[PDB]
Design a protein around this ligand. Structure first.
Ligand SMILES: CC(=O)N1CCC[C@H]1C(=O)N[C@@H]1COC(=O)c2ccccc2CSC[C@H](C(=O)N(C)C)NC1=O
Ligand SMILES: [Cl-]
Ligand code: NA
Length: 285
């Protein structure tokens, strides 16, 4: 019985919510709040423990970018602080390889990072690895074939359709086939050996289009679009299906939770979050 966790987000200000969705019975659990509110964070799971990485606390009286790493234990309902990253990283992308968390790009005020760092839970340490070829904030990260992909984003001047690949053994990045659409703040995940890029912002409007990367053919193909246009959406894979949580449609902060079935190439609304929000960190455990 695995749950879909949603941490943080934004609705008028950065949020502290930690909530878990049970896709089996349709219930929502209210868990212990994050110690510091945060949006533009990323979530991941290492050894049954949930991690909230980077982000920013936007308050009506002041904004603070986050270098924080926090760990949630589902068994104890407690958040524990971990070692912080070298730099604050808002609109961060995260990926896990061999129980190691990679923190990809993000922003610190005026700085758009191309830098990448790796966390070792066993040692409680961050170390910088090779930086990306492109500075990317609002970047989608996916782990496929023990390689780390950085998809789309914004480099400080331009919204990107470009994507690159990290080889951990060789400690190097290579540019891959670019997407058909420019996407900053897309939901990026792996399902059945493919990378999916859902939604985002093309520099003009929020997108409902979804495309998947096939590694054997090195091509991006459009699949069924979502019912709602969304950027800063949370994304996860649970039991062979993609779940997209909340996001921003250009006016409204969505509470809508859509589910993609690859067998039928269809999206459907499965639930509603307790409240609408964007820039949530999502993981399954
Ligand atoms: C830049 C901006 O506007 N502001 C002004 C104050 C704070 C910030 C804001 O509001 N951010 C939140 C949070 O989103 C995110 O964490 C996020 C996460 C990943 C990628 C992209 C995003 C942005 S999604 C775009 C949407 C927007 O532009 N609004 C509301 C006008 N911003 C939001 O929802
Ligand atoms: Cl933001
Ligand atoms: Na490739």
């Amino acid at each position: 019985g695995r749950l879909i966790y949603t941490a943080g987000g934004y609705f008028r200000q950065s949020l502290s919510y930690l909530e878990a969705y049970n896709p089996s019975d349709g219930t929502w659990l209210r868990l212990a709040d994050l110690q510091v509110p945060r949006s533009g964070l990323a979530g991941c799971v290492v050894g049954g423990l949930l991690y909230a990485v980077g982000g920013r606390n936007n308050s009506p009286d002041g904004n603070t970018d986050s270098s924080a790493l926090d760990c949630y234990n589902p068994m104890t309902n407690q958040w524990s602080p971990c070692a912080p990253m070298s730099v604050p990283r808002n609109r961060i992308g995260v990926g896990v390889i061999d129980g190691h968390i990679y923190a990809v790009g993000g922003s610190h005020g005026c700085i758009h990072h191309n830098s990448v760092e790796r966390y070792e839970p066993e040692r409680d340490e961050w170390h910088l690895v090779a930086p990306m070829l492109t500075r990317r904030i609002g970047v989608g990260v996916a782990v496929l074939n023990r390689l780390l992909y950085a998809v789309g984003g914004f480099d400080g001047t331009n919204r990107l359709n470009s994507a690159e690949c990290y080889y951990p053994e060789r400690n190097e990045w290579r540019m891959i086939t670019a997407m058909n659409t420019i996407r900053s703040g897309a939901g990026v995940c792996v399902l059945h050996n493919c990378i999916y890029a859902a939604g985002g912002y093309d520099g003009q409007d929020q997108l409902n289009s979804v495309e998947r990367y096939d590694v054997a053919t090195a091509t991006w193909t459009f699949v069924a679009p979502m019912k709602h246009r969304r950027s800063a959406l949370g994304i996860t894979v649970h039991q062979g299906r993609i779940y997209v949580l909340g996001g921003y449609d250009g006016h409204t902060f969505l509470d809508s939770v859509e589910c993609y079935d690859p067998d039928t190439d269809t999206w459907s609304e499965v639930t509603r979050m307790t409240s609408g929000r964007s820039g949530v960190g999502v993981a399954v455990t």
